Design an enzyme around this catalytic site. Structure first.
Site, PDB file in Angstrom:
ATOM      1  CG  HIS A  28      41.167  39.027  32.497  1.00 23.28           C
ATOM      2  ND1 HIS A  28      41.202  38.344  31.277  1.00 23.28           N
ATOM      3  CD2 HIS A  28      40.007  39.484  32.539  1.00 23.28           C
ATOM      4  CE1 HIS A  28      40.624  38.709  30.523  1.00 23.28           C
ATOM      5  NE2 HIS A  28      39.500  39.339  31.035  1.00 23.28           N
TER       6      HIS A  28
ATOM      7  NE  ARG B 101      51.901  43.100  33.511  1.00 24.65           N
ATOM      8  CZ  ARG B 101      51.322  42.207  34.547  1.00 24.65           C
ATOM      9  NH1 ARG B 101      51.048  41.067  34.304  1.00 24.65           N
ATOM     10  NH2 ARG B 101      51.547  42.703  35.937  1.00 24.65           N
TER      11      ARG B 101
ATOM     12  CE  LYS C 216      50.559  36.458  22.313  1.00 26.76           C
ATOM     13  NZ  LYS C 216      50.895  38.018  22.689  1.00 26.76           N
TER      14      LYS C 216
END
Ligand SMILES: OC[C@H]1CN(CCCc2ccccc2)C[C@@H](O)[C@@H]1O
Ligand SMILES: OC[C@H]1CN(CCCc2ccccc2)C[C@@H](O)[C@@H]1O
Lengths: 803, 803
Positions: A344, A536, A647
């Site tokens: 990741h 974040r 998104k």
């Protein structure tokens, strides 16, 4: 319309089941019921519609006995479940009507649901989107993790500073889960290894119980309902068994499932083994209820989401060797064919390396197995690259040094048949840099699976207005086949469509502007460009670069106050890890800038800086449809993929970003003319590192940048604490790992181009249409279909199960 | 027949709701369901029938606004709820039929339910019987306590030794409770007192949250359903708010409701204040929703079950004075008229005396209030008895000495308008001895309310066979009017009735003998006299005197082996407090005797000693109907009442006992010719104490007793550990507080008379009939009617609420 039919029989039936649940389930009358009670009555009514499908889905898998997919993750960032369930069951309009007739606003009730916040960010949300796509694609898939009592902390902002508070998400109960105390399993810790005539034995262990809680995962209108099983830690009944203290010390065992870690602690290792040990017993049970473990990889796939569940590899070996008595080589063959690993990030600070002394004490048998895996692996490296002694030390699962550590990523690569990155550029970097040696040994293992997002939650659910105007032109098929959005290209010159796209955006912006006034008492101009960066708070995501742009605009306004500028609302949101000092300072900076900018009479409503408090999935569903500009400005090479980017693209925002992560593929799909790309490429960053990055050079040659640094240093943004931001300036000037100054000029220039396009509403909207229309590739249905065919060896299906 | 009607409509309706719950509530199909799943489906079906009545009962109290009764107890020993609910709702036959038609045995399903074991023994069971009677008598009553996560420990016997294990009674869930997280209340601890212009203020406190869980309490066939509210401890969301530890330390606050204390620790004091503080806020809220606190005692009664909730007195003063701003004298008037106190024992080891330094730190404002109460109280004593300085020190709530303590019993008497004992002899002892001074000051305060047991649980539920043969002759009216059992006197010479009574007993004994073989693999002769002593293991209850009798019989058999003796099965059961060494030794002795006796070929099946493991309410419901002889043999003056005695009387056992507690009233009601009374009276015990109790005297003059002591000392009952019982012998010989030897001769003699009567089955049964027939006074309906009229000032009602 996209929200399904509101039939006379269904509306009547929903209303009576609502009333039954209010009376019998909640034990309330209409005269004492609160909005919360109404939410729960609705939740239970909708839940009822799942169970029939849930039971028959699991019954169906027992009969057909397909290959089962086990997705192991320590994070599942689910958000709210009610609306998602209605959407996937085609119940949204029916419930809306049924509640309307009861004198209730369904939207009001939806806001009462707590986010299931069992994740930090992108990794946990990815798992959640993946579960949705796996059910929608009819795969026999199970999500396995931990039922944390406390999810990610709620962020409060006090005096511009982040404060953390416990996320007590289970306080009022969770209507979606079903406790399965009957399927409780034992998990072992500590103890010692004993060698006998008949192999090794792990003895004198402490037992913690693992209690499963099942949550239903409905597919999109296919009557498939899969299971997410989350383990809860329970002490055994003879635990520590003066008397009172023994009972109170049960807390120690049960602490395992108490809290989600933000971001080498013993409790974290315990969590990692706990989920792995309990899950694997379940996997084996289900496999035995189909002796012959040759067929194991034909019936089981285990996906390791990051290295967090990497102990699955030595745990599987332990079970096969110590308990089932298979020989090492056959057990290893089975393990490798069963497991696959997803990386990741390439950032060193995120890579898990466990001290040997920890594993020694906690999992002594697992350490022995890891040593044996390493030895056999290094013999294979030695034979493939004879005499290459440095390769051997580089590739070892055991890192020597001050403290000895196990590299969990190296463990995962050795024990998996497939290793993937999460976007094309990331996957290439893996092969070129950090896993180069492993790629040279086993090139066949290395794959790419570019991330995706679910179009159910991230379009239909959060942006019904957009979903509907799309459905009007091309139908509803795209919801489970997002590539169909390409058909929207033939509408780019359609004056009716242009007007509608822009209208939906303005409505979203009006709705969000109202949300801000109501729940946070803040006032914004809905005509301004909504410039948003939500994710974040980390130095690599470069919220600071955004901050420098904001200050530049402010300084430009103060310099030429009566000059015209495109009005902007700049929104930044995200959580800082509790111990991450710099991240906390950046939040303080953002609020400090707002304090100055938002109260300058000369600025007016031309520029606003808002910090979005407590960013989470439910907040994302509100701000993303309202965005005009998506900030995706990580230093090239650092953001493995990003998913927020996708998104925003799907929801009608234009993207300003670097060539990083999935931004590269997004720009490729839309055409780079329809993206605002700026800044260094990966190769440019490499050149700068070889030469040496000197921030001072930029400070000396860019007067606008110099002024901002002088403003920060002198106390312009902190009048009562002049040196408040000394740490930030010092970092920027002397030890900036992420080269903020290096991208400043091109970023500010690119932002000017954004503003210019926004002045022409028609051409802005046409570019938006070209983005939405090419966003199809970034559906998690595509991602999961690729995992299924290329890694797990199973075929997706869009076929309905009987209702 | 006593179990109600099994109508065609009802049976059909129960069956479909059963299936609905199995499917929707449990998420199971018929092919995967276990007996446990079936139990839960039944429990939820029965629960549904309560809620309508529960809501309308609480609605009814809101309208009619009656005086409300608050029963505060730290213990509620509820046992199982399913069957009790069916009985009180007239659903037992209908559910039996409905389950039969589904292919299920309802009795099998009933055994799956865990005891709600939120009590130790008689005090907690009394509260449970009282709740039942209050609902049956239509009083607006609420039981308030703590929802312990762990109830009384499960007792395991290992090698004859008691082992404790956690009672994880909530593991599979509790279908009966309803969490009310919306009515969570704050409770304060620690802090300090600040004096201002406007009175005292309690500041810098730590907050613990109190979350209520409501359990329904159905009355007997009157559609009244009252509430038992139990508080659970929750940490606030900013608690301690590195990050991880703050979340993990939430356990500290939540430990308050974790475990029930067996039997001066800080956690126990916290529990005591926690229940009191949360309960009183609820009481006041409900009162305000009817400013004028003059009417408070007209609308509220608070019953303090023992001294455990005694902090209600200074807490009520605190609220009235500090918060509502009432003057001291008026607040005190209200407090006294509101509160009443029940004393449960005269034994000094049970009396609560809290160190001042504890209250100083935990509840500093309450200590100040207690000091002020004491001062004003002692001024009243001084004025009534001038110059009597020793009376002043004797009556003080503050005990001076090494450590300063607060006497909680003295606090309760001062702050209550009524003080009662729990049987006539106990209440007299209170006035004559420990509370003599207080009785001389305020004779009007002192009352008796002899204990009782509910005839629903303790006859209809556990002994349907007996309930039915009674109903055949006199109808069903006695179930809520137990005095009607007197009508059975006219059946004492009825040959049909005699035969039936004896038949029911034999069936009960056969059923219990089977239970023992199945669940405990032990074999008993069902023709033997069932001699049973079940209750907490304590020296005052004199299980040791029973042990001496058992050994005497064994020694008599071994002496004259071919002589005929009435066969006996001697059953002793009960739990020892974890830290009570002597009690644990007695359990070991009982098992040690069994080891010798049960395996002696010469004895045969003439004598068996069985230790009944894990005694609890559900076990009581099985062994009590099977008993022939009830052992109630406490030293006269020590057992305040007893309630087990009454259970045995109602269920067809004859009683061997001392003139202690309620035994005196039981013998008075039946006639002493129908009881086996032996041993010293209270006056005889007093004479012996004045003279000095010398155990050696009995040892020297009774050769049969000498032999037993020599057997214990020499290692007859512990061959491999000869001195195992040295502690017991030493205690018996030198420091026996309870004068075991003094009652030995008369006890053994009286036991011979028991055996003689048992040889004549007809005359045994006629005496049994005279006991059952006069057991009416010992219904808790009578007890509660007396509390209502004589203490709380309310009228009981047998009138139905609408269904
Ligand atoms: O694959 C899901 C996401 C996973 N994240 C992992 C971030 C890991 C990280 C965690 C702490 C500090 C730095 C990095 C990176 C994103 O680019 C991906 O989209
Ligand atoms: O009132 C209920 C019962 C209350 N118990 C209280 C026993 C208290 C005690 C607790 C520990 C040690 C000695 C005594 C005595 C019985 O006689 C009563 O029937």
């Amino acid at each position: 319309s996209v929200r399904g039919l509101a039939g006379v029989e269904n509306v009547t039936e929903l209303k009576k089941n609502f009333n039954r649940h209010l009376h019998f389930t909640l034990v309330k009358d209409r005269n004492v019921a609160t909005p919360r009670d109404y939410y729960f009555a609705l939740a239970h009514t909708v839940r009822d519609h799942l169970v029939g499908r849930w039971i028959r889905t699991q019954q169906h898998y027992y009969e057909k006995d397909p290959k089962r997919i086990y997705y192991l993750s320590l994070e599942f960032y689910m958000g709210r479940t009610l609306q998602n369930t209605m959407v996937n069951l085609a119940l949204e309009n029916a419930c809306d009507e049924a509640t309307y007739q009861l004198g209730l606003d369904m939207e009001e009730l939806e806001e009462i649901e707590e986010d299931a916040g069992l994740g930090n960010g992108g990794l946990g949300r990815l798992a959640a989107c993946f579960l949705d796509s796996m059910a929608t694609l009819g795969l026999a898939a199970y999500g396995y993790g931990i039922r944390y009592e406390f999810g990610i902390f709620n962020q409060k902002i006090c005096g511009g500073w982040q404060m953390e508070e416990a996320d007590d998400w289970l306080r009022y109960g969770n209507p979606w889960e079903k406790a399965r105390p009957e399927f409780t399993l034992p998990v072992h810790f500590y103890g010692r290894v004993e060698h006998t005539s008949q192999g090794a034995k792990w003895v004198d262990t402490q037992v913690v119980l693992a209690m499963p809680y099942d949550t239903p995962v409905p597919g999109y209108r296919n009557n498939v309902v899969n299971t997410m099983r989350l383990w809860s830690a329970k002490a055994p009944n003879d635990f520590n068994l003066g008397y009172i203290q023994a009972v109170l010390d049960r807390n120690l065992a049960e602490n395992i499932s108490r809290v989600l870690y933000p971001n080498g602690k013993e409790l974290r290792l315990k969590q990692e083994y706990f989920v792995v040990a309990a899950t694997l017993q379940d996997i084996i049970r289900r496999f035995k209820s189909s002796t012959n473990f040759d067929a194991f990889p034909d019936k089981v796939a285990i996906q390791l989401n990051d290295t967090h569940p990497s102990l699955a590899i030595p745990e599987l070996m332990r079970v096969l060797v110590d308990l089932e008595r298979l020989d090492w080589d056959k057990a290893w063959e089975v393990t490798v064919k069963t497991c696959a690993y997803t990386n990741h990030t390439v950032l060193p600070e995120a890579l898990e390396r466990w001290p040997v002394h920890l594993l020694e004490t906690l999992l002594p048998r697992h350490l022995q197995i890891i040593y044996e895996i390493n030895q056999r692996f290094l013999n294979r490296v030695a034979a493939a690259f004879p005499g290459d002694v440095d390769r051997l030390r580089r590739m070892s699962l055991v890192e020597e040094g001050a403290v000895k550590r196990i590299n969990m990523a190296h463990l995962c690569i050795a024990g998996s048949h497939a290793v993937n990155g999460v976007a094309r550029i990331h996957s290439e970097i893996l092969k070129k840099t950090i896993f180069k040696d492993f790629y040279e040994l086993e090139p066949h293992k290395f794959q790419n699976k570019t991330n995706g997002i679910t179009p159910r939650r991230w379009l239909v659910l959060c942006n019904p207005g957009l979903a509907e105007i799309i459905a009007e032109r091309i139908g509803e098929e795209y919801i489970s086949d997002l590539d169909q959005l390409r058909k929207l290209l033939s509408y780019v010159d359609d004056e009716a469509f242009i007007r509608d796209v822009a209208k939906v955006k303005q409505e979203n912006k009006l709705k969000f502007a109202a949300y801000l006034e109501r729940e946070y008492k803040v006032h914004i101009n809905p005509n301004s460009l909504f410039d948003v960066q939500v994710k974040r708070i980390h130095e690599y995501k470069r919220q600071l670069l955004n901050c420098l742009h904001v200050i530049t605009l402010y300084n430009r306004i103060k310099k030429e106050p009566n000059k015209f500028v495109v009005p902007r609302t700049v929104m930044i949101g995200g959580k800082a890890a509790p111990g991450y000092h710099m991240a906390k300072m950046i939040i303080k900076l953002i609020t400090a800038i707002g304090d100055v900018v938002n109260h300058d009479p000369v600025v007016g409503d031309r520029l606003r800086v808002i910090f979005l408090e407590n960013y989470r999935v439910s907040l994302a569903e509100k701000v993303i449809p309202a965005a005009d500009l998506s900030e995706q400005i990580s230093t090239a090479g650092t953001e493995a993929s990003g998913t927020g980017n996708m998104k925003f693209m799907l929801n009608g925002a234009l993207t300003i970003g670097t060539m990083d992560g999935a931004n590269v593929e997004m720009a490729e799909e839309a055409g780079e003319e329809n993206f605002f790309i700026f800044g260094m490429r990966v190769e440019d960053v490499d050149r700068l590192d070889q030469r040496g990055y000197n921030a001072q050079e930029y400070y000396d040659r860019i007067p606008e940048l110099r002024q901002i640094i002088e403003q920060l240093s002198s106390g312009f943004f902190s009048p009562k604490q002049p040196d408040l931001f000394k740490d930030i300036v010092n970092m920027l000037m002397h030890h900036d790992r992420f080269k903020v100054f290096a991208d400043y000029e091109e970023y500010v220039k690119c932002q000017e181009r954004v503003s210019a396009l926004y002045k022409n509403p028609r051409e802005w909207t046409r570019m938006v249409i070209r983005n939405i229309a090419t966003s199809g590739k970034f559906s998690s249905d595509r991602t999961i279909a690729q995992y299924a065919r290329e890694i797990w060896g199973v075929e997706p299906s869009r076929q309905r199960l009987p209702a």
